[PDB]
Motif scaffolding. Sequence first.
Motif, short mmCIF file in Angstrom:
data_model
loop_
_atom_site.label_atom_id
_atom_site.label_comp_id
_atom_site.label_asym_id
_atom_site.label_seq_id
_atom_site.Cartn_x
_atom_site.Cartn_y
_atom_site.Cartn_z
N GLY A 1 31.52 -16.70 -26.97
CA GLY A 1 30.85 -17.98 -26.89
C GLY A 1 30.87 -18.52 -25.49
N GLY A 2 30.40 -19.76 -25.35
CA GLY A 2 30.33 -20.41 -24.06
C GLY A 2 31.65 -21.04 -23.66
N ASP A 3 31.56 -21.95 -22.70
CA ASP A 3 32.76 -22.60 -22.17
C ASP A 3 33.45 -23.45 -23.24
OD1 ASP A 3 30.32 -24.23 -21.80
OD2 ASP A 3 31.70 -25.73 -20.99
N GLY A 4 32.68 -24.17 -24.05
CA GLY A 4 33.28 -24.97 -25.10
C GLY A 4 33.96 -24.11 -26.15
N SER A 5 33.34 -22.98 -26.49
CA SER A 5 33.93 -22.05 -27.45
C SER A 5 35.29 -21.56 -26.97
CB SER A 5 33.00 -20.86 -27.65
OG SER A 5 31.87 -21.23 -28.42
MG MG Z 1 28.47 -24.29 -23.60
#
Ligand code: MG
Lengths: 761, 761
Positions: A107-111
């Motif tokens: 996933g991305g940075d938040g993930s």
């Molecule tokens: Mg993100």
Amino acid sequence: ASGAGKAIGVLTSGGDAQGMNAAVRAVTRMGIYVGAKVFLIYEGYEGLVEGGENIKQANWLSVSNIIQLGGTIIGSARCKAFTTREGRRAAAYNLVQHGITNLCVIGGDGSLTGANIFRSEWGSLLEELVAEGKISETTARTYSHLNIAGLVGSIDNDFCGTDMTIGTDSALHRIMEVIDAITTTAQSHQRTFVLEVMGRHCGYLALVSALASGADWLFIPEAPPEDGWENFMCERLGETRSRGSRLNIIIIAEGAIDRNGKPISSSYVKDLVVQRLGFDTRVTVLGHVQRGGTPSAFDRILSSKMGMEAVMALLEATPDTPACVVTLSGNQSVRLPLMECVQMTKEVQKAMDDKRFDEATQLRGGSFENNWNIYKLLAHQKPPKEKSNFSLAILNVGAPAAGMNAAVRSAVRTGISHGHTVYVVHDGFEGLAKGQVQEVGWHDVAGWLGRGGSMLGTKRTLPKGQLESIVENIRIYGIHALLVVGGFEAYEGVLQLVEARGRYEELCIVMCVIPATISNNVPGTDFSLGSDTAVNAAMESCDRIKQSASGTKRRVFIVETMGGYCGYLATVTGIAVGADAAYVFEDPFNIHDLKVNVEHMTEKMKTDIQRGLVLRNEKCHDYYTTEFLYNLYSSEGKGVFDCRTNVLGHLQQGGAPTPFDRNYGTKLGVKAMLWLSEKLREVYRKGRVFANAPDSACVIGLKKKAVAFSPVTELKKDTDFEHRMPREQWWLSLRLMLKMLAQYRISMAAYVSGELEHVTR
Amino acid sequence: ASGAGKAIGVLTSGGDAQGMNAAVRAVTRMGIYVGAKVFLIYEGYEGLVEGGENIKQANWLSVSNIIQLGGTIIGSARCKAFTTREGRRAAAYNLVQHGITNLCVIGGDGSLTGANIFRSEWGSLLEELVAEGKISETTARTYSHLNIAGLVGSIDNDFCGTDMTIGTDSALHRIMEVIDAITTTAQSHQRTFVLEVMGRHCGYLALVSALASGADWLFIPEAPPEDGWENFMCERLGETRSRGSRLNIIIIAEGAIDRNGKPISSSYVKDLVVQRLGFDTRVTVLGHVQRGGTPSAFDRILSSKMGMEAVMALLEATPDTPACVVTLSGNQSVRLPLMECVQMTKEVQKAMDDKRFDEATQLRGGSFENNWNIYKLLAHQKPPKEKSNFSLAILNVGAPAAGMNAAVRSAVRTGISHGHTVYVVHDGFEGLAKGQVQEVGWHDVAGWLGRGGSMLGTKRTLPKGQLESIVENIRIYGIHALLVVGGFEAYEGVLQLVEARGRYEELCIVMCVIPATISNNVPGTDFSLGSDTAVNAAMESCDRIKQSASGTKRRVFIVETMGGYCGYLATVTGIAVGADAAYVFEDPFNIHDLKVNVEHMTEKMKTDIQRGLVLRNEKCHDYYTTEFLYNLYSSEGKGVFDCRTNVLGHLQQGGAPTPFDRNYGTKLGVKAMLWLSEKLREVYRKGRVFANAPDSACVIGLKKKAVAFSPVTELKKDTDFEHRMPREQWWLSLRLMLKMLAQYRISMAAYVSGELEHVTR
Ligand SMILES: [Mg+2]
Ligand SMILES: Nc1ncnc2c1ncn2[C@@H]1O[C@H](COP(=O)(O)OP(=O)(O)OP(=O)(O)O)[C@@H](O)[C@H]1O
Ligand SMILES: Nc1ncnc2c1ncn2[C@@H]1O[C@H](COP(=O)(O)OP(=O)(O)OP(=O)(O)O)[C@@H](O)[C@H]1O
Ligand SMILES: Nc1ncnc2c1ncn2[C@@H]1O[C@H](COP(=O)(O)OP(=O)(O)OP(=O)(O)O)[C@@H](O)[C@H]1O
Ligand SMILES: Nc1ncnc2c1ncn2[C@@H]1O[C@H](COP(=O)(O)OP(=O)(O)OP(=O)(O)O)[C@@H](O)[C@H]1O
Ligand SMILES: Nc1ncnc2c1ncn2[C@@H]1O[C@H](COP(=O)(O)OP(=O)(O)OP(=O)(O)O)[C@@H](O)[C@H]1O
Ligand SMILES: Nc1ncnc2c1ncn2[C@@H]1O[C@H](COP(=O)(O)OP(=O)(O)OP(=O)(O)O)[C@@H](O)[C@H]1O
Ligand SMILES: O=P(O)(O)OC[C@H]1O[C@](O)(COP(=O)(O)O)[C@@H](O)[C@@H]1O
Ligand SMILES: O=P(O)(O)OC[C@H]1O[C@](O)(COP(=O)(O)O)[C@@H](O)[C@@H]1O
Ligand SMILES: [Mg+2]
């Protein structure tokens, strides 16, 4: 050694970066290859929370025929439950119910921030869970440690610790497809193309897109425009018009702001351009298109590699080692601790909130700042008040390759910037012998980024047959440096000049090879300029071919790829397309191996998978040609499957360069020119240039983690001149992943995975 | 016969519809083929006004290697001078200075309106010019009549008299490439994709895009939404969600309005969806992307045909005949007077200005209204309170063809709407024999439009062998009609069932054949469903293959195309790609012809064109194979050019359907179901269906002008069953255009051009 008796969970969260499916496929098939149980967690942290039906054990065929699919078959969802401990405890419960002590989060940075907070609370959550009575104390001492391997899947590239994320290359493919619709048209009237990309937080996509397209202006939140930019931009567009350039490209990020917090809208830039310039201005907003389409070749290979390394890192990880993110810095796979990367992301976010705002761009990574400097240098001709007696000629040698023109364009601009008198020679060494040398200016390379092949001529002829004419023309034009953008014949020609220095003093000039060839057969680099374009064209043809057998019919396709004796193109293409076998010269095979592979194909073909694909490098075997393999597969597969053949000839060659090739050639042309200038200043003594040391003749080289100038004389040891390839090629380890993903039981003890490395501040 | 001693002017004006370069190339190369002098007027009416340097005589190489380029090499400009008589007189002067009494105008509605007003005043302008003293009375009596042949080059399709314009198909290619980026991805979370097309005046592009993509809702200026559409749309999206459909597509034209004059913005629809539904809504605005990219295959062929016909119409035009527009209604070429088309355009514009607004959509053309009705019918399942005892089975027979799935989807929805019990049999006649009959519903065909190949299985097995099983399964399932979507095997199988009616009473059922094949070898139609996709894939590979030789290198490529004995694919692909020769079975060639063509290629390769391309149909010749032609061309071209070979195998087969193929299969599938329902009601007597007449088994056509229904027994006369193709094919006249455009002196007295026709009210 094998991870038997332990279970691996794989989930996807955040925006569905294309290439996620390749990572999921590689994670699953590696996990059940090593004997671990693989559980697919659907909808990401959502299905992690609810669990139950959303967690299913995977088999080999659960992730079959997804590598070409964009998005994610597992599915991703935004859930607020994982933010709170109420849902995170339920997630820990559902993981314990399936015995999943190993989790891979794509996933991305938040993930990955959520994964970091989930590890940090894993012990506390398990304690509170046994306290509340949903799990006994026994069965909780086991699973006391949760192993996390993160994969950065996002189009934003906002995760600071990581240089390249899954889906960035493919998002760039979508963007440049849109842009090439504009630029490849015969530009008829003055028009302004205002492209709005979704880089709301990170402007990496906006930057690399601008660099690849040669945008006139760029609005990125990392570097908002100075006060009074309205006038400065409009004047730049004005002189752009005066040049006769009929198209202006404005790349505006979603997060475009000024030096204050006020956002800059694409509608504002539109109306601004219309008012002061009167150009036909229309705003193109990609929207969901950036995340759409198939994953690029690079995305499929790299997602497969990182998913494999994610699994391996997750099994060799003890209770003490921290959560890691499997990524690549340069070409080298590396594992970075999750906590440090998340901390850097928080620091850069605080910096971007007008704390260390001018110094936030450096913390984004040296790649970002370097890319932005290269873009601005090439965008507008600043006045080079410096001048030098140095004069350099730029050659294109060997076969044409996509991205030669990007390298030559950047080299020309950068050399003019240093005050060098830049020449081009047509037809490579044939024209350098024939004196086909022409002085070139800044605007003579205008619009050369997207042009495939070679705007300069290319010839394969080596210099040894016209060494007298070459030294004559070097003397005439006073060529103090020689840039040769080409394939193995470029390296071999520069080598012949270095070896000929002893006979001719005039050949003691700084030489630099930019390797640019389809085959990726040049020593001293990991990627030749234009290999990516060939791989992308090859997979597209292979995907088209593999999609032609409709779902009922069982058919195998023998697809012959180019690349000479270098098998790189065949093997990576096989990884990208899920080819069953990629026959190459570097892995000699006999009829015993062919019968094994054919029976393996037959057995696989009796299952639910119905389209097989074997690749053959054109020069892999003397006798077992494509026709031989066709006869073999069609005979043994009688009554099971049909066989067909397709020789991808020059379909892999003439295409326009992919966005990676444009940016890569851009960067190497800049870096080659920087090194050329540095070496020429180091070598200029006694009022003349005298380049006798071996260091003055280098292949630019992208090797492992960084660019590295290797002297051609040193590289002569590791060059198989008969086969026109290096003797020890880094990519033979990718064969192991190829064979693993096709169910071949191959002991991959020779594969080396990237170790833990701290973030480079 | 030839137009010697007279000069032809060609100009482009308005928006640069891609495919204009193909039309310009054909106009130029026909004008200098017939001996007329061709003058290229740059910047359109602008360079008409200034003239001088802007008017240049064309040679054969002036339009070399432009057919694949979008935009227009001639260039277009908006000039207000042509609006006023001051500049129009200067335009008439500059035409008289070069003796250009013949003008071909390639442009949009405004361009052709200006051309009409320019002809209407040509006599008055010449009178005022001689009166003012810039031309003598002699030299003005000659050129007293100006001949105008118009070509509609625009993405708008706003010219009412004409059905299809140059660049419409390619603009649709751009639109659907963007939509396919969204739909082909694994749809992971609920998202709404709102695509904004530039159809500011005409909503035809929005409409056909919606039809091809299966848009949930459509805002077109022709039919603005009723009051309270806000709730009705949001509910439609709501039940779409409840179905589990995870993507909603809203096609909103730029000219989207409500029943009042207030425009509906894409941002408004975005915020509306976000507020009531919460879906991730992002607006995609194509902007300049629509006019970008390469011209589609259709655009190149039709532009070439209409440009040739424009020249021919311009030479056979006496002083009395009026200005005409060369266009195609259906597959038939036709010439319409410019004045009547301009009048209709003015009437529709006045109607759209709240005069006859509800009745303006019909004056746009019956095709628009029919397309909108088909779209709305297939979009949302309305409750079919009507019911009928009739039941029908849908087959996919032969090879898979791109667009079969679209046809089956439309047939299913239309049959359910008419109350029929629709079955689908998997694997064609094999399944019908084996009883693989599965009743199908509305949502079982959801998203079948863009899916290439065949969701239902295809088998080539003819029904004669298992005829007892077929009649048994028809009796078991009570199949009253049979809809067979497929190639020559489909037509032949339906013919076998019709011939066996005498033996079996159950086979006396209404039958319909939808021709769907790559080869376009099915008698009774001009375009088999999916032939367009194969042509487009073929040219794309040929353009890549032609793009691969670069710079100095002179090289010819022998490309082998598929299509069996039917040469259609080779010939049209040769036209689209500018191939020198397309060797086909229907045009038998011997070694004398080969030596002529090889020497022709050699002489051409000594000129400044360096990349020849010849096509070979796979079964054109028994002995002069692709290897033979490789050997011949490479030997005779020794010292002049190199030769290479590429057999496009299944690269022409597995692609997703082009937008043309999707819309075509959609429309004819609806029409086939309408015709089936009408025939079944006409044949139902004595409480049962008994279809014994030959007219009850027809191939749906589109044969010259509109859709036709040719009985299979009648088509048996004009069918070459040994070669599996019709005996008389319409497209053999296109060989003459191909050869003419490749400098072959071929007496095309056998070519027939469309005659003058008045507008259909
Ligand atoms: Mg993100
Ligand atoms: N600090 C955090 N703590 C816990 N969970 C988090 C945190 N950040 C994000 N998440 C979880 O990860 C999910 C994805 O986050 P988000 O929607 O913001 O996109 P992202 O992770 O940043 O990557 P992308 O932009 O590509 O979509 C969220 O639903 C959220 O539940
Ligand atoms: N093509 C461009 N697009 C966007 N911003 C640009 C472009 N060129 C220059 N800029 C920015 O506009 C500002 C002034 O530009 P300019 O280069 O001409 O003077 P400068 O102060 O010397 O900038 P720099 O630090 O890069 O040398 C700089 O902040 C620069 O980042
Ligand atoms: N794929 C292509 N093939 C051939 N010509 C091309 C292609 N793309 C652009 N061009 C041509 O290059 C010409 C020069 O303008 P172009 O937009 O391409 O570069 P530029 O933006 O103006 O300069 P710079 O590279 O420094 O940014 C254009 O007129 C266009 O015709
Ligand atoms: N009523 C008219 N009379 C004279 N000249 C006209 C008229 N309309 C348009 N023209 C001329 O034709 C040129 C192009 O016309 P216009 O701007 O309306 O685009 P178009 O021809 O309608 O095609 P498109 O809208 O797709 O771009 C104009 O510059 C103008 O000089
Ligand atoms: N998919 C769609 N796209 C655009 N407009 C639509 C769509 N479906 C319905 N409409 C429009 O909404 C209006 C009402 O829709 P609906 O079909 O449900 O009732 P109706 O009485 O049968 O109207 P009608 O049959 O004439 O279209 C109609 O005017 C129709 O044009
Ligand atoms: N080229 C494709 N290949 C495979 N699946 C596809 C393709 N295109 C669409 N689909 C699938 O079809 C499914 C059905 O939903 P979709 O959005 O495509 O249309 P729909 O609303 O359900 O029906 P309709 O035809 O009326 O538009 C989607 O989930 C999508 O995954
Ligand atoms: O010499 P390189 O750099 O390996 O170029 C690779 C290309 O040249 C080839 O040898 C073919 O070139 P040709 O078609 O001109 O004969 C192939 O290996 C490949 O298409
Ligand atoms: O039988 P059709 O209708 O002509 O189908 C055309 C296809 O069949 C072919 O004969 C090839 O079919 P196969 O690949 O199955 O062997 C080609 O001519 C073409 O690709
Ligand atoms: Mg117009």
